[PDB]
Every structure is written in C-alpha cells, then in structure tokens.
Amino acid sequence: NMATVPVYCVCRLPYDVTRFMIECDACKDWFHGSCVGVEEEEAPDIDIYHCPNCEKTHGKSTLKKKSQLFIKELRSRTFPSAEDVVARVPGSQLTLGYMEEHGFTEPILVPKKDGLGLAVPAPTFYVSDVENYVGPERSVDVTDVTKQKDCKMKLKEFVDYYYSTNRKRVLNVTNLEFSDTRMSSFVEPPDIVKKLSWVENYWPDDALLAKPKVTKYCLICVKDSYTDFHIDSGGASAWYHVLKGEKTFYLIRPASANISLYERWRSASNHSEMFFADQVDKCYKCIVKQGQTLFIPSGWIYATLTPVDCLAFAGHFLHSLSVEMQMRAYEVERRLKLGSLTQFPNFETACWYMGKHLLEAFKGSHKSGKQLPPHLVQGAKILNGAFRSWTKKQALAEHEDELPEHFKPSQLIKDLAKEIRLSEN
C-alpha cells in the first residue's frame, strides 16, 4: 500500500535519521555525508557548502570559516502520573456532547488523530519546510532557555541554529502564529475546538477589529529544552499536537490556592530561579508522544520538558464551559501586567460579542419557551458584571479600545441584567 514521499541526495532516497546529511547552499537539497564525501566531524569547518553539481557553476565550497541542573531537578522529583486526572478519549468520541457531560475540567489526551477532524502535515514535514512556508525573512520570537529571556530574530537565523551540529545555546520557538502565512493552509484546528470557540461561533465577519490571532501556533523545541510554568492568556483552553518528537507536560490544577501562588510567583522578579512545583500539592506529569493531541482546560498551570527535538502545533480558544475561570485568569493577568507578547488579543472584544449572543439567546428562550441552561445564565452574570467594570466612568478609558464598533454598553448591560433576573424564577 505504497505512498509518495520526498527523496534527497544524489541517490534519491528518503530521509534516513541514522545518516548524517548536509544541505547544499545553492540547490537547497540535502545530501548524505557519505555520498558526497563529507564527514560529520569536518562539517563545522565549512562556511558555504556546494554539492559537486552546483560546484560546476556556483563555485567551490567555502571550506574556510576563519539550566542543565534545573532539568536534572525535574526528574529528581517523583510526580504522580496523569492517568488519575487526564482521560484517554478516542477522537471520534470527543464530541460536543462529551464536553457538556464532563464539563472540560481536566485535560484530555487523544492518542490517535483519527476522529478529531485535525488537519496536520505528514510526519515527513521538517523544520526546513517550516522555514519555506512561514518565510525565512519572517521575524520570530526565540526564547533563550538557559537565560530565560526572549529575543527577536529572522526565522532563517533560527533554523540555521536548529540545523547546526553541537548547539552551544538552547533556543526555542514557542510563539509563532502562522495563520497569516502559506503554512496556515496545511494546519486546521480540531473540529471540537471550532465548535467550542467563541470567536469561531460569535465573531462577526464584518467586525472592524481583527480576530484574536491565536488560532494556529507552531512550536520548535530543541533537545533538552524547558518551558516554565504559565497560564494561557485570558484563561484560554489550548490544544497541543505533536507532529514529531515527544513532550512532557507538568500540569497543576487551577485551584484557588495554586492560582494565588502562581500570581505571587510570576510577579516575583526572580521567578526563573524558583521552581514553582515546590509550592503546589500535586503536579501531574503527562507524556504526549508523537501523533498524540492534548487538550488543556482553562486556567491550568502547565510547564513542558522536551527530551528530543519536537515539532508541535497549538491553538488557543475560549468556550462557555469555563467562563468564571477565564475571567479569573484574565484578572490575574491584568494585575501581573507582564509583557504583551504571549497575550490574548482582543479578549474583551470576544466577551462583548459573547455577551451580545447571550442576550439574543435570552430573547430566543422567551420566544421558544425554554430557558437557557444554568451555566449560561451564570456566565451571563459573570460577563455582565465585567461589562460594568470595563465601561465604568472611571475605567472606560482602559477598555474603550477593545469595545466593538456600534456597541452601546449601557443598553447591553441593562438588557442582560433584566433577562438574568427574569430567567431566575
């Protein structure tokens, strides 16, 4: 049952993970080191490499170039397995009805992509292909794992680091939204995510403000890298799919004590020198392998450990099953006032659109003679209270920018309050 795959080098063979290869700078093709007489030891001495076919016209090769203990402190601990809390659900059985029955309060791991409606490239898709479709000149946010700092650089400069032997630095790319690139057509979020997303359902097509550019993330994590504990912006639930390699997740339940500890920990200037898992009771260790998809609920504090080179796709979304938790995380995020790099764009704008939808649902409930489910009523009250805080005379200037066009908050707040009171009998 054959299929078609790319081939490389003069021998025109598929990629071999056990064979050292070097890419010609002219034809952009990879050649086996043994095939072209290049040994892996002598590879760093080369500046520009040209294969013999390219050397005929483009000239000869320029063969003249002129936190580890912290990772050991992660497996030093004996964390409980995720099987106690993380459920294993087939993609076909992870439907909208399943979410309503269980409430999406614990992470869900789907071992097989089948049934999820997830569209991802074939496993023969490499970081070299990521550069071509995202754009080699596109600027990306690269995280220095050892220094725990961020810096901007060209994508071609990072991929040069990725495809270099004996990496001196530990650099990761975890904030790369490619929905505006050619690679966006290759990735489609799981169908359950699109069903549950507030933006996918309630964001108007003619809205002047742009939709939250959080739908398609690409992650390139190098071997023996680490990402610290964090909460996704706005309490957005997330989905992670590992195309190649594997990832280890360290999940902490968003309990009231744990959320408070995270806020105080993240606010501290020396939060990178403090291991956050010390202060929490239970920190579940979950291993997401190749081809597996992990769904993280709202407000969960998670960190990742990468034992091998890993290419993964992720996305953030908001749903109606964790309205209270999403607001609480957003309030914590606002108080922290951290860097607006991994933030959730137009989080309040989505809430205003959600509030408008809830008011229409309340009108529909009156017409149809069937009141809304209790969680929608509670979420409406939570959102309605936030609307008053955002549009208060002493706080409107902060939240006016995210207010949608042709929106009169005073009418919306008054209508929601009356509908909630009417639907509370």
């Binding site: 993970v17 056990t18 290869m21 890419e23 892996e40 495809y163 270099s164 032997t165």
Partner: peptide, 7 residues
C-alpha cells in the same frame, strides 16, 4: 552549512 545529525 545546515546539517542533519545521525542517531
């Protein structure tokens, strides 16, 4: 020169 190591 971009390279791919062995395993």
């Amino acid at each position: 020169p971009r390279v791919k190591a062995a395993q």
